[PDB]
Design an enzyme around this catalytic site. Sequence first.
Site, PDB file in Angstrom:
ATOM      1  N   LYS A  71       5.348  -6.943   0.178  1.00  0.00           N
ATOM      2  CA  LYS A  71       4.073  -6.324   0.354  1.00  0.00           C
ATOM      3  C   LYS A  71       3.557  -6.919   1.688  1.00  0.00           C
ATOM      4  O   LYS A  71       2.602  -7.492   1.814  1.00  0.00           O
ATOM      5  CB  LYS A  71       3.029  -6.853  -0.971  1.00  0.00           C
ATOM      6  N   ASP A  74       0.628  -7.383   7.465  1.00  0.00           N
ATOM      7  CA  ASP A  74       0.189  -8.193   8.805  1.00  0.00           C
ATOM      8  C   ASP A  74       0.072  -7.110   9.898  1.00  0.00           C
ATOM      9  O   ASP A  74       0.150  -6.054   9.550  1.00  0.00           O
ATOM     10  CB  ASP A  74       1.248  -9.263   9.071  1.00  0.00           C
ATOM     11  N   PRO A  76       0.958  -4.969  13.335  1.00  0.00           N
ATOM     12  CA  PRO A  76       2.319  -4.397  13.746  1.00  0.00           C
ATOM     13  C   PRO A  76       3.276  -5.269  14.060  1.00  0.00           C
ATOM     14  O   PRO A  76       4.519  -5.049  13.885  1.00  0.00           O
ATOM     15  CB  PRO A  76       2.017  -3.483  14.504  1.00  0.00           C
ATOM     16  N   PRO A 179       5.833   0.465 -12.240  1.00  0.00           N
ATOM     17  CA  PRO A 179       6.069  -0.735 -13.002  1.00  0.00           C
ATOM     18  C   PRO A 179       5.456  -0.379 -14.235  1.00  0.00           C
ATOM     19  O   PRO A 179       4.537   0.278 -14.463  1.00  0.00           O
ATOM     20  CB  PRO A 179       5.103  -1.822 -12.337  1.00  0.00           C
ATOM     21  N   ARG A 193       9.634  -8.985 -16.761  1.00  0.00           N
ATOM     22  CA  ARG A 193       9.278  -9.817 -18.183  1.00  0.00           C
ATOM     23  C   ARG A 193       9.814  -9.402 -19.520  1.00  0.00           C
ATOM     24  O   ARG A 193      10.510 -10.103 -20.106  1.00  0.00           O
ATOM     25  CB  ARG A 193       7.862 -10.403 -18.289  1.00  0.00           C
TER      26      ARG A 193
END
Lengths: 212, 212
Positions: A71, A74, A76, A179, A193
């Site tokens: 994920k 920040d 570039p 997901p 899980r």
Amino acid sequence: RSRRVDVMDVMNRLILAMDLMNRDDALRVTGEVREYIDTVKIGYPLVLSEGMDIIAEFRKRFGCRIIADFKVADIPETNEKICRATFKAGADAIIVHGFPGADSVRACLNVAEEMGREVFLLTEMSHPGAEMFIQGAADEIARMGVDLGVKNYVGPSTRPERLSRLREIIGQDSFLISPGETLRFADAIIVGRSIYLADNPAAAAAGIIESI
Amino acid sequence: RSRRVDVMDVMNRLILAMDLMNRDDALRVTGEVREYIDTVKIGYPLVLSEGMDIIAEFRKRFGCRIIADFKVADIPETNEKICRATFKAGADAIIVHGFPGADSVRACLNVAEEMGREVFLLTEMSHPGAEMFIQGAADEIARMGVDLGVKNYVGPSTRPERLSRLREIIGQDSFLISPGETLRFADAIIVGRSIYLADNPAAAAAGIIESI
């Protein structure tokens, strides 16, 4: 949905979210379900705890594709460096946030293009807190990805109408993973899980696949 | 683009990629769309599963041209034998890789010239893995084909600027087919799944043609 040639082929349309943080457990459980998947998503808990060398270890021991769920969020220049280090360690793809804007996403796309790897844009998340800011920015983030030529997306894991909406924005050919029906919009589902915490991981995986 | 006399005339500029592996299904679905196409591309899954006699069966039952998508990629002597067996079985043309080099391509050209058939040079592919080595060799492979007098080419199926570039290298008269605007550069498009996996193959084909 039929498979598109220009995007990744995920076996059985099932991606294992291997979220265990211990190397021994992660490799053991993945081994138990290796016949059911060829694509594994790994995140920071495992990599920070055991080292980035674990990515190449999975690829070699299982012959699988690795998606690094980092994920990336920040500026570039830093995103560029994170992507380069991740791809140097062997990751086939990396997941990047869109909220930091277009230039931050472009930096990741540049490194993936240079190294022959892929970037997945995370358009939305499904935890409760996602309602504060992420939900309201999702459609605009997805459009930003389309506008930059992004071909791989990670979408919501709770609401179907959200999938058709994301699919509408990104077009019928881009790759979408989700997901958690779903496969009428997404190209593959991510399960963690329900498989790795199961008393019989293999049984859990086989059950999910036969259902697919 | 206008038709050139010295290269093959493909009806409706649409080539059916008949990728089904079962003879009954392949013949049934092709029958459903026979009024829309006169050129069919067949590959190894069908031929290995049902026998090379299936090529002549298509030509006789549908009056169509058959392009054998065998992506020939061996040494010269073996390429010669593969081409001869394929043409003896009735194929009008065969698709050959260029990465094994010029002598491997020439071996195929020699047999096609002897038997009055055609060779298509595959200059690039569009699956993700093609970025590793194929993308970087594409322009050089296309130039190699031009230099050897190749007149038929198979190009990328995802990026337009790649088509104009290939068209620039091969010249305005050679025949170019592309999997998947496009017809401003390519002479015909290849469509498979969008037709054979459709609930109504005929409707799918007719829709594509009217658009052309």
